[PDB]
Amino acid sequence: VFLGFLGAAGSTMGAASMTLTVQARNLLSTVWGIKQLQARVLAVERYLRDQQLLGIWGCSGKLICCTNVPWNSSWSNRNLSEIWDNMTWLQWDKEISNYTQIIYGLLEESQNQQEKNEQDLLALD
Amino acid sequence: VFLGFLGAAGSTMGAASMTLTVQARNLLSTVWGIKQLQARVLAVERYLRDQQLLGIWGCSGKLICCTNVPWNSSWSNRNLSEIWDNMTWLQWDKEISNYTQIIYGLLEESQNQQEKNEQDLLALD
Amino acid sequence: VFLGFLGAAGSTMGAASMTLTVQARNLLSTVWGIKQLQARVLAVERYLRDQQLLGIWGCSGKLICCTNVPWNSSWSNRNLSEIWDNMTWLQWDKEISNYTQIIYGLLEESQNQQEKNEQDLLALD
Amino acid sequence: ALTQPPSASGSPGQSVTISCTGTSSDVGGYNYVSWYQQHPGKAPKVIIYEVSKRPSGVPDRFSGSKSGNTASLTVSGLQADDEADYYCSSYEVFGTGTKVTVL
Amino acid sequence: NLWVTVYYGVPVWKDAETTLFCASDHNVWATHACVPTDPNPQEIHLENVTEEFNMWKNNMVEQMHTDIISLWDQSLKPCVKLTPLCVTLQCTNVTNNITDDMRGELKNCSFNMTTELRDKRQKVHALFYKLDIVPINENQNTSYRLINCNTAAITQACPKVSFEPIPIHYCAPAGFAILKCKDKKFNGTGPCPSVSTVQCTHGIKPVVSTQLLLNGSLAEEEVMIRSKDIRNNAKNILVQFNTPVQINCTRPNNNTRKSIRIGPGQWFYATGDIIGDIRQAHCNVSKATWNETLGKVVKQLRKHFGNNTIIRFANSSGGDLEVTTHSFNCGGEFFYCDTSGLFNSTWISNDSITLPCRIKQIINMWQRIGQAMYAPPIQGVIRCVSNITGLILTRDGGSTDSTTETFRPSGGDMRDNWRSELYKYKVVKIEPLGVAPTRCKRR
Amino acid sequence: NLWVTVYYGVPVWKDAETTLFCASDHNVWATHACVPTDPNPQEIHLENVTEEFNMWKNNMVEQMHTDIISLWDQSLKPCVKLTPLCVTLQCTNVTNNITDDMRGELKNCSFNMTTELRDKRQKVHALFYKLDIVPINENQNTSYRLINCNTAAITQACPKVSFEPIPIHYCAPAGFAILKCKDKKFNGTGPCPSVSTVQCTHGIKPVVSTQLLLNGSLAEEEVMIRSKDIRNNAKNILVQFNTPVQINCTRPNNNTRKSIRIGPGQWFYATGDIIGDIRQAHCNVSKATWNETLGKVVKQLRKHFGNNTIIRFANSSGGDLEVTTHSFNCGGEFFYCDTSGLFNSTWISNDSITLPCRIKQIINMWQRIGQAMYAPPIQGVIRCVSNITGLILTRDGGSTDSTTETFRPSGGDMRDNWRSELYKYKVVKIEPLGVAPTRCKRR
Numbered sequence A, B, C: 001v002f003l004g005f006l007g008a009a010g011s012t013m014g015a016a017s018m019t020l021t022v023q024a025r026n027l028l029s030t031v032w033g034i035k036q037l038q039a040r041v042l043a044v045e046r047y048l049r050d051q052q053l054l055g056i057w058g059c060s061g062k063l064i065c066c067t068n069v070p071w072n073s074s075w076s077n078r079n080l081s082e083i084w085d086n087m088t089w090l091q092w093d094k095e096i097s098n099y100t101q102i103i104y105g106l107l108e109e110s111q112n113q114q115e116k117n118e119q120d121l122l123a124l125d
Numbered sequence D: 001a002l003t004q005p006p007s008a009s010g011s012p013g014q015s016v017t018i019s020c021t022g023t024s025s026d027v028g029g030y031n032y033v034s035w036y037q038q039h040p041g042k043a044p045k046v047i048i049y050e051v052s053k054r055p056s057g058v059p060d061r062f063s064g065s066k067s068g069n070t071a072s073l074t075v076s077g078l079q080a081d082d083e084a085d086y087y088c089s090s091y092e093v094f095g096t097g098t099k100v101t102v103l
Numbered sequence E, F: 001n002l003w004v005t006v007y008y009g010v011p012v013w014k015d016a017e018t019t020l021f022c023a024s025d026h027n028v029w030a031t032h033a034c035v036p037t038d039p040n041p042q043e044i045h046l047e048n049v050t051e052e053f054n055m056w057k058n059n060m061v062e063q064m065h066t067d068i069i070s071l072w073d074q075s076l077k078p079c080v081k082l083t084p085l086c087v088t089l090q091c092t093n094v095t096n097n098i099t100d101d102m103r104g105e106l107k108n109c110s111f112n113m114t115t116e117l118r119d120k121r122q123k124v125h126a127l128f129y130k131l132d133i134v135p136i137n138e139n140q141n142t143s144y145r146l147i148n149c150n151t152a153a154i155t156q157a158c159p160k161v162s163f164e165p166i167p168i169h170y171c172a173p174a175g176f177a178i179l180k181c182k183d184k185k186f187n188g189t190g191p192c193p194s195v196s197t198v199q200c201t202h203g204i205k206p207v208v209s210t211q212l213l214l215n216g217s218l219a220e221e222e223v224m225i226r227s228k229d230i231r232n233n234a235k236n237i238l239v240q241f242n243t244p245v246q247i248n249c250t251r252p253n254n255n256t257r258k259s260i261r262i263g264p265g266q267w268f269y270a271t272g273d274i275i276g277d278i279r280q281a282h283c284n285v286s287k288a289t290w291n292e293t294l295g296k297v298v299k300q301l302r303k304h305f306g307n308n309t310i311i312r313f314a315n316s317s318g319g320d321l322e323v324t325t326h327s328f329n330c331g332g333e334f335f336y337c338d339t340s341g342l343f344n345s346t347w348i349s350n351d352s353i354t355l356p357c358r359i360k361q362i363i364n365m366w367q368r369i370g371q372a373m374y375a376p377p378i379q380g381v382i383r384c385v386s387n388i389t390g391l392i393l394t395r396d397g398g399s400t401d402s403t404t405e406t407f408r409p410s411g412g413d414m415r416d417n418w419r420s421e422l423y424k425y426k427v428v429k430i431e432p433l434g435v436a437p438t439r440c441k442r443r
């Protein structure tokens, strides 16, 4: 499982988006019998929290998920070639750390809950 | 995350159904280093059990999920206006505690497994 | 919950595929207060790992999941009647233990990631 | 090795500037230059640490900077409780000492 | 017509009992293990919610009781054991100038103590209080023993561990919530129409005392009288004040700490001597403030016992010293103060008070078996200022006069003290999953 | 135009601090609790990745320090306590043939020891080193005590627990990764353009020593000089060699282990006697190899202090014996070797060395309070061959001659030793979730 882990860390975002399963499979597994257990418990919570995010968004069970949130040029004005072909995910995460929680809120609030309510109303027509 | 938690506990079920993400995000996180760890483990199991229910039903990854189980007037004869507009979720849960496991069984047994088998058979046509 | 557990272990695979929820619901729950806690933690990890497999495949939230991996006669030349009507799951698992990781790799690599990328490209047409 | 003027002087209300000059080359060794104030009779107290940082509880009046070999303090807002001995330090070296006389 | 729709995230809860964890801003209550607190903790008001509360079945009190006892044992575990001190003591009366109040309360005892070398002994002398020393034999041999030597092993408290109560917060784990009743005239039990949800409780200082509640919470408007059954004289009445009464407790004696090496790395801390005169420890309360506070307590008791019933306060009828006196820990010293002048009044419907206090250095906290603690002396003079924020009273039963009610101080069960702070908090578990009819059908 | 697309599994990480667990292939470091290691552990090279590394803020060093101390305490907990040994000792000079080097270092002490029966005592005699025995009184009474009896309790190490360091590996839990800098000229701090991810660190032996780093890792090409601030004389300079220097340490005396029953099931292990002659323990290093190694160290120091500055090596200026000597554990015995001949040279820009070693049997590892360990004697003759792979040096400050720099051995803080192995490892946490613009829109 470990093999290939973080190998595309220095690759472009496009090239590094085809190895998502390699990172995904590496997120899940005498006081030293307690502390290690705590670490195991910690890993589970982190995994579940990320999965919870994917579930409050319409992204449950997916590694690549398309959404209805428009991109804002304030978050980033770079082209697609300057993000996917000429840029790595670490650089992108360093720039967009500043805006992550606005995008997360837009993902959580407007799009998924309005889409879910609209499916609730279309299903009773 | 905590902010707004249980705020719609006294609101109507309709008004309180638009804040589901607020409760959903608050379900997941020296003998005192063990007992607290047990509590953390306990929370995970509860979360997973509820998610497991949603998965055995056709509701995985959703906060609002529509099903094929007809409502039975024996469970409740109240109108929709007397449930969603003039009633809270605590009152509803107190009345329908008596019938919860019948609805859960109907959700688990007839609808999801028959739908899943019917998709298994439609996919081979 | 326990009632009916593994009851179809000796039944045919077809008959034993209609009781999947019974096994699914039984996977989730002083040094003896630590060891038992470790066991609980262990169960969670196993559950999550299996769920993770189902998520890296296109099978999240499903107990029966159809895929795009063709069956290979090298894995098994038996008919459908000799698998579903005249055979149990333990016998099938004993034969196909030898081939499980090839099927798992084909499930993980070609079909789901190519399908996910193709949906990523169809959604922008 | 950290020469300092023998004495400095100011008038109440105006500002004074003390300079510390280092014989050695720059060699990026001047990042950690601190200043001390020794009211006669007591033990020195720290007014500036790392060229232009202030210990919590030190008034904004004391403020130093640096230029190559040299590095200076600026006592802006000179009162009558500023008759002390001001010493520049780079690690273990101490300055030679400047007696700031109030006028 | 209508179909089952599943909702996840439903704001519904059930009564629950769980293990609440800790938040706090060389301490008895650990504090390092306890999680650090978070600034500006969120409080959310639940509008249109009426929730039933029972203080008298609140598992937060039982958990706090267990946690404080366990923390006390954990603090005592690594400290010096004083089992060698069970030797014959030769005790005489102190020869300094001693006030009549203290003539015979403090004894000068000499004994043969061990040293770092197992083949040597030292002749040493320590000052001991009379409430910690037992005559070995009825005859006047002047040979005495420590009070615990026959029944329990004694451990010295670590001098570096402060006995000052610090506020602690009890926090619910994920999936659970703490509900806080915000009604300001809440009698303890029943529906609460004004409810909020909190991450953690307020800062609760686990102050250990009897008969008077010290450094607690005040009632917002009026004195509150809370009892599980006000007609049952076997249950205690918790009185919560709306104004604190300041109590000033002092140990006037200047004290020294003498260190005796009893083992290779074990030190025993003796009183040694007193510099200056010897005077009795005592507590002062304002006479007028106490008298108005008792007037308010009587005014509130008449709401339960009648507008024309005589309310009498009298001293404790019996029990051990911890419950017949106002016991408390302040400054590191343990005071047992005589409250016979606080409760000495008849109230018909129509300066300062000085309470003498005795000191013990050998304490058996709670009522454990086979474990006592020696309290090392504190150097200097102890001056303590505390707020009296409530009372624990017991009503006299079996009365032969129905026109008068008599109330006496009680205590000794610390769950009644910590229930005076946790009375407004309830723990519930969240039930986020629910079903309801809608017109939406699954395709 | 562009829409938010969520990606899960993104190869992004953050700086983190977590609890790394253990992997290893009757041991002090437990080893049973530590997880078994996996053969052929995967190493993945991260290409086009430049990662900042700080050895001087690496939490792996603090975790290793805490873990080694805790493991030492856990190993000592179930072993025989020697508190009864704090008795008066009657010590005379050894009467065998003793070399002048050792005349007065070893004393023959007799004492009254306890037995399995509490009403009996035995007269026994044991050989003790002079660095473990203290005169009870200034007068010539010939009565002596163990060095620790006044300040700390002493516990005997279990003879069945070997003191040989074994390699251990620190492994990240799931969700975390260990990044390894593969640059072979890495000065410790700064960007590393050659990075790999590992499941666990290499095999690190937790060797406890001062002034010389033993059985460590070698520099790949050149001697490496690492310091948090090379201009700050209060910080230590870690020198990593590119070639090891072989050091041969011996305790020449043939030794016996005498077992004395001190309790119902408790044994005390005394030296007893020496068969044959008595000779001083010592370490030998090659003179030429050490001289070329010092030449290389000087060549590297001139890159920081100037091509024309004189580099002088001198012995330790002060501190306790653990830091003024090269202290180490080999064969089960604790050696304190005098390195005054290793650092005795002036280097201007233009056979074997024998280090005497003293032995102690009473060791206070690290600087804990109230806990010492008695090291039982090892039977036979101890012969030890180790690699010197580095130095811990301190530069003399306050110099009045700017043309000469003086370096002296230091140590005593084992975090500088274990930081010499963990310098290339960093712990990060994985951030698999991210967002990016694409042209794909949700239907």
Ligand SMILES: *[C@@H]1O[C@H](CO)[C@@H](O[C@@H]2O[C@H](CO)[C@@H](O[C@@H]3O[C@H](CO)[C@@H](O)[C@H](O[C@H]4O[C@H](CO)[C@@H](O)[C@H](O)[C@@H]4O)[C@@H]3O)[C@H](O)[C@H]2NC(C)=O)[C@H](O)[C@H]1NC(C)=O
Residues within 6 Å of the ligand: E162, E163, E164, E165, E207, E209, E214, E215, E328, E329, E330, E331, E332, E383, E384, E385, E386, E387
């Ligand atoms: C109710 O609350 C009040 C107010 O908090 C509280 O009184 C306070 O008690 C503490 C502890 O007894 C006092 O703090 C001490 O003050 C003395 C004054 O000289 C100091 O010497 C003490 O420090 C020594 O002891 C410490 C250990 O106790 C050591 O850590 C320290 O190094 C010193 O050796 C210590 O600061 C505080 O002054 C009073 N406050 C007032 C206003 O009197 C009272 O005890 C609480 N009541 C109950 C029943 O708990």
Ligand SMILES: *[C@@H]1O[C@H](CO)[C@@H](O[C@@H]2O[C@H](CO)[C@@H](O[C@@H]3O[C@H](CO)[C@@H](O)[C@H](O[C@H]4O[C@H](CO)[C@@H](O)[C@H](O)[C@@H]4O)[C@@H]3O)[C@H](O)[C@H]2NC(C)=O)[C@H](O)[C@H]1NC(C)=O
Residues within 6 Å of the ligand: F162, F163, F164, F165, F207, F209, F214, F215, F328, F329, F330, F331, F332, F383, F384, F385, F386, F387
């Ligand atoms: C640096 O590394 C070297 C090489 O690993 C290391 O030297 C080795 O030390 C060990 C332990 O001291 C030696 O192994 C011992 O050898 C003797 C020779 O007679 C044996 O008697 C020993 O066994 C007895 O003791 C054991 C407990 O220690 C018992 O388990 C056993 O039953 C016996 O009673 C033991 O095997 C080893 O020989 C040397 N190696 C060399 C090449 O000299 C050195 O110590 C390390 N340096 C440091 C500072 O740690």
Ligand SMILES: *[C@@H]1O[C@H](CO)[C@@H](O[C@@H]2O[C@H](CO)[C@@H](O)[C@H](O)[C@H]2NC(C)=O)[C@H](O)[C@H]1NC(C)=O
Residues within 6 Å of the ligand: E093, E094, E095, E096, E108, E109, E110, E125, E127, E272, E273, E274
């Ligand atoms: C308690 O008794 C001891 C003796 O048992 C007293 O110690 C002696 O005090 C006198 C005072 O004049 C000294 O001269 C002696 O040298 C002391 N003897 C020793 C052995 O120390 C002690 O003072 C008494 N203390 C009190 C408070 O009564």
Ligand SMILES: *[C@@H]1O[C@H](CO)[C@@H](O[C@@H]2O[C@H](CO)[C@@H](O)[C@H](O)[C@H]2NC(C)=O)[C@H](O)[C@H]1NC(C)=O
Residues within 6 Å of the ligand: F093, F094, F095, F096, F108, F109, F110, F125, F127, F272, F273, F274
């Ligand atoms: C240490 O001293 C003891 C006596 O305290 C010595 O033991 C005696 O050694 C002589 C040697 O001729 C024997 O005859 C005696 O029988 C021994 N006495 C006992 C009680 O055992 C011991 O040899 C001395 N050891 C050293 C190394 O000096």
Ligand SMILES: *[C@@H]1O[C@H](CO)[C@@H](O)[C@H](O)[C@H]1NC(C)=O
Residues within 6 Å of the ligand: A007, A008, A010, A011, A012, A015, F047, F048
């Ligand atoms: C690193 O960059 C080079 C171009 O400089 C590229 O060819 C190579 O594939 C990249 N490595 C990885 C792992 O993507």
Ligand SMILES: *[C@@H]1O[C@H](CO)[C@@H](O)[C@H](O)[C@H]1NC(C)=O
Residues within 6 Å of the ligand: A072, A073, A074, A075
């Ligand atoms: C983009 O962000 C800015 C603030 O940075 C905001 O004012 C603006 O409305 C946003 N645009 C869109 C289209 O959401």
Ligand SMILES: *[C@@H]1O[C@H](CO)[C@@H](O)[C@H](O)[C@H]1NC(C)=O
Residues within 6 Å of the ligand: A077, A078, A079, A082
């Ligand atoms: C977009 O592409 C052009 C192509 O010439 C490039 O020069 C430019 O820097 C890019 N713009 C942004 C905002 O990334």
Ligand SMILES: *[C@@H]1O[C@H](CO)[C@@H](O)[C@H](O)[C@H]1NC(C)=O
Residues within 6 Å of the ligand: A095, A096, A098
């Ligand atoms: C966000 O703000 C921080 C400073 O608070 C800055 O470092 C970062 O680069 C900002 N974002 C962008 C896109 O520059």
Ligand SMILES: *[C@@H]1O[C@H](CO)[C@@H](O)[C@H](O)[C@H]1NC(C)=O
Residues within 6 Å of the ligand: B007, B008, B010, B011, B012, B015, E047, E048
């Ligand atoms: C409580 O009820 C009132 C009507 O009595 C309503 O206006 C208010 O919005 C309700 N509060 C909440 C939080 O829903």
Ligand SMILES: *[C@@H]1O[C@H](CO)[C@@H](O)[C@H](O)[C@H]1NC(C)=O
Residues within 6 Å of the ligand: B072, B073, B074, B075
């Ligand atoms: C409703 O419930 C009753 C029992 O309460 C049952 O007999 C009846 O058949 C149910 N109706 C439907 C339509 O399922």
Ligand SMILES: *[C@@H]1O[C@H](CO)[C@@H](O)[C@H](O)[C@H]1NC(C)=O
Residues within 6 Å of the ligand: B077, B078, B079, B082
């Ligand atoms: C349905 O609505 C009517 C409207 O008049 C109301 O009076 C009645 O109580 C409701 N019925 C039920 C069963 O809730």
Ligand SMILES: *[C@@H]1O[C@H](CO)[C@@H](O)[C@H](O)[C@H]1NC(C)=O
Residues within 6 Å of the ligand: B095, B096, B098
């Ligand atoms: C279910 O039964 C209980 C008594 O067993 C009763 O309290 C509850 O109200 C019942 N359900 C309904 C809808 O009345």
Ligand SMILES: *[C@@H]1O[C@H](CO)[C@@H](O)[C@H](O)[C@H]1NC(C)=O
Residues within 6 Å of the ligand: C007, C008, C010, C011, C012, C015
């Ligand atoms: C066991 O096999 C028999 C036929 O031999 C069959 O009738 C029976 O149903 C099987 N049992 C189960 C549990 O499937």
Ligand SMILES: *[C@@H]1O[C@H](CO)[C@@H](O)[C@H](O)[C@H]1NC(C)=O
Residues within 6 Å of the ligand: C072, C073, C074, C075
């Ligand atoms: C089936 O498996 C064999 C190896 O066992 C392989 O060579 C062959 O290509 C596979 N066939 C298909 C259709 O994938």
Ligand SMILES: *[C@@H]1O[C@H](CO)[C@@H](O)[C@H](O)[C@H]1NC(C)=O
Residues within 6 Å of the ligand: C077, C078, C079, C082
């Ligand atoms: C398929 O079915 C036939 C029906 O006659 C049976 O005899 C045969 O064994 C089966 N073949 C395999 C490969 O299972």
Ligand SMILES: *[C@@H]1O[C@H](CO)[C@@H](O)[C@H](O)[C@H]1NC(C)=O
Residues within 6 Å of the ligand: C095, C096, C098
């Ligand atoms: C797989 O190989 C094992 C022996 O390695 C064998 O027991 C097993 O039966 C093989 N698979 C099949 C389908 O025979």
